[PDB]
């Protein structure tokens, strides 16, 4: 599910032409170089979510803390109800999109 060499827009088009609703990938962050970002498709559209790396754990700038990016991705894959945005709408990591 990690795509080392793509931008946010490329991630969008990848998810829209090779994924389904619930597909996601992780990629490096344009705005926070060196960090990572989740791109997630839902209801035919793609949103993006910054991942924080403090050097002691990974998280989504809030929520549970993880030792590795993979543990983070695995956790939200297994806990579809946990990524609620302020709107109240859930965003579900369902199907990793391979490279």
């Amino acid at each position: 599910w990690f795509h080392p060499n793509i931008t946010g827009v490329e991630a969008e088009n990848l998810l829209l032409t090779r994924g389904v609703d619930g597909s996601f990938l992780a990629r490096p962050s344009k705005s926070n170089p060196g960090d990572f970002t989740l791109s997630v498709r839902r209801n035919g559209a793609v949103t993006h979510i910054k991942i924080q790396n403090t050097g002691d754990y990974y998280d989504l700038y809030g929520g549970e803390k993880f030792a590795t990016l993979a543990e983070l991705v695995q956790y939200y894959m297994e806990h579809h109800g946990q990524l609620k945005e302020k709107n109240g709408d859930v965003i579900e990591l369902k199907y990793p999109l391979n490279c």
């Binding site: 827009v9 705005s31 993006h48 910054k50 700038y61 929520g63 990524l83 609620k84 302020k86």
Partner: peptide, 9 residues
């Protein structure tokens, strides 16, 4: 520059 979500966690 793409859209980023504001999460309530």
């Amino acid at each position: 520059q793409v859209e980023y979500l504001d999460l309530d966690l």
